[PDB]
Design a protein around this ligand. Structure first.
Ligand SMILES: *[C@@H]1O[C@H](CO[C@@H]2O[C@@H](C)[C@@H](O)[C@@H](O)[C@@H]2O)[C@@H](O[C@@H]2O[C@H](CO)[C@@H](O[C@@H]3O[C@H](CO[C@H]4O[C@H](CO)[C@@H](O)[C@H](O)[C@@H]4O[C@@H]4O[C@H](CO)[C@@H](O)[C@H](O)[C@H]4NC(C)=O)[C@@H](O)[C@H](O[C@H]4O[C@H](CO)[C@@H](O)[C@H](O)[C@@H]4O)[C@@H]3O)[C@H](O)[C@H]2NC(C)=O)[C@H](O)[C@H]1NC(C)=O
Ligand SMILES: *[C@@H]1O[C@H](CO[C@@H]2O[C@@H](C)[C@@H](O)[C@@H](O)[C@@H]2O)[C@@H](O[C@@H]2O[C@H](CO)[C@@H](O[C@@H]3O[C@H](CO[C@H]4O[C@H](CO)[C@@H](O)[C@H](O)[C@@H]4O[C@@H]4O[C@H](CO)[C@@H](O)[C@H](O)[C@H]4NC(C)=O)[C@@H](O)[C@H](O[C@H]4O[C@H](CO)[C@@H](O)[C@H](O)[C@@H]4O)[C@@H]3O)[C@H](O)[C@H]2NC(C)=O)[C@H](O)[C@H]1NC(C)=O
Ligand code: ZN
Ligand code: ZN
Ligand code: ZN
Ligand code: ZN
Ligand code: ZN
Ligand code: ZN
Lengths: 206, 206
């Protein structure tokens, strides 16, 4: 019969109050004989009624796919509230229930350190600026680079790695030509994480 | 019917001539009515006959599982030879063929840099020694730490990350208490990779 998938908000949407985090409940393999789909949403077991369900959409494999979106409150998600999607369909023996929440566990604030290019690499035409983020929990995190208000997008970040103390770490490598680095330009590593003050911090390098 | 899975050698076994890399051809879901399994092995399409097939082994879901192991030559694997496992069974319409080789692509030698703890972290009771390995291809790689001939095992390494030039990088973080680091002890980052001389290099820190 039908199958339900429940997806969390985009991590960056949970960390910036300016943005609207949403949870998305997707039902696939809805038949033509049983096309009616009913969604019920609960927040910590309390039924809520402000969800937005889109009209069914027929797929190329002859099934219907229907989606329901519930906006979530910034503080609710961060405070660990649980979001239950309940899907009812005539072709089902009983309704399907899916629950989702923010990654659970005691939060731990990242420590952010920047490291300049080593001497050996300062013989190359391009040098690595490194941002070390360690000791954070949970693993949800965003890292960007900037200089003079404008973003520096020639960077790559490792996934979070589980450390031996149960927290996470990662590294972010921004590559700039010596041209800008030897002029003394300030480059900034920006880190977003729930456990930071305002979920934000930045460390500069020069 | 039956299914075949073909697994490569352990990466570290391919980089040390002392060791014996092996490719392993696993056949699952062999029935009781058709228990006979025949393996044929080819190296670049040439049939070879030195493989070691283990006796069938009945599983808890009422099927047989049978495994064939072919030793591979250090230089053959590194030189991109292709290993074909061919499985024949009466319950099959036609034999199943699986081919495997070393990750393909032009090799690129890693650059290894070590970075000492930043000043900010030197206020903590434990400091991070960092080993940056960048510019390597393919992504198969091994990284360890040592000091005075003995291994330093309190470390974590990020997975390889695909860089913007199509090569890979990673970082390895060894955590030691200031006790050993302030005594001036030499810690060594050891990197194994096909494209290094003897597939090995090391960079020390102090
Ligand atoms: C009939 O067709 C249905 C529609 O599929 C589309 O229609 C045609 C055109 C086909 O060509 C399809 O290829 C095409 O995609 C099928 O629906 C799919 O069903 C499967 C299960 O049978 C679902 O698989 C599950 O996918 C989860 C991830 O889904 C995200 O990622 C997909 C890309 O990787 C993407 O297509 C999805 O839309 C969704 O993408 C995210 O959506 C959210 C919310 O909208 C966004 O917030 C994100 O930004 C999106 N991110 C990305 C990267 O797009 C998996 O998580 C899940 O793995 C789970 O199940 C596995 C086992 O399967 C477990 O092991 C695991 O632990 C976990 O529980 C799972 O694979 C798929 O999502 C459905 N696709 C869509 C679009 O809804 C029908 O299956 C098909 N039926 C038949 C009989 O043919
Ligand atoms: C009947 O039972 C068979 C035996 O399974 C065991 O028996 C009983 C006790 C059950 O309780 C089982 O849980 C138990 O495991 C089943 O065989 C299994 O079939 C599935 C497919 O149906 C196979 O899945 C495939 O697994 C690949 C990885 O396999 C490695 O990792 C497994 C753990 O993750 C491990 O169990 C395997 O032994 C193997 O482990 C490696 O072995 C090599 C060589 O020996 C070593 O060199 C490594 O060091 C080992 N590494 C590790 C970590 O152990 C996957 O790669 C593969 O994903 C592939 O297929 C998927 C789709 O499924 C693709 O999407 C993907 O792209 C890729 O192609 C796949 O999942 C599984 O390996 C089989 N298990 C064994 C032990 O052989 C039967 O399936 C089952 N049948 C029925 C009808 O019940
Ligand atoms: Zn229809
Ligand atoms: Zn719950
Ligand atoms: Zn907040
Ligand atoms: Zn039997
Ligand atoms: Zn081939
Ligand atoms: Zn060699």
């Amino acid at each position: 019969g039908p199958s339900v998938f429940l997806f969390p908000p985009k991590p960056k949407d949970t960390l910036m109050i300016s943005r609207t985090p949403e949870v998305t409940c997707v039902v696939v393999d809805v038949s033509h004989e049983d096309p009616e789909v009913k969604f019920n949403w609960y927040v910590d077991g309390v039924e809520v009624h402000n969800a937005k369900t889109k009209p069914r959409e027929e797929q190329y494999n002859s099934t219907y796919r229907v989606v329901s979106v519930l906006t979530v409150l910034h503080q609710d998600w961060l405070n660990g509230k649980e979001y239950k999607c309940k899907v009812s369909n005539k072709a089902l023996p009983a309704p399907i229930e899916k629950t989702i929440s923010k990654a659970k566990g005691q939060p731990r604030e990242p420590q952010v350190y920047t490291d300049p290019p080593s001497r050996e690499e300062m013989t190359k035409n391009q040098v690595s600026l490194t941002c070390e983020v360690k000791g954070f929990y949970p693993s949800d995190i965003a890292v960007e680079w900037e200089s003079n208000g404008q973003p520096e997008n020639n960077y790559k970040t490792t996934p979070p790695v589980l450390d031996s103390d149960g927290s996470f770490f990662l590294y972010s490598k921004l590559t700039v030509d010596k041209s800008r680095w030897q002029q003394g330009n300030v480059f900034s590593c920006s880190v977003m994480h729930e456990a930071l003050h305002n979920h934000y911090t930045q460390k500069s390098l020069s």
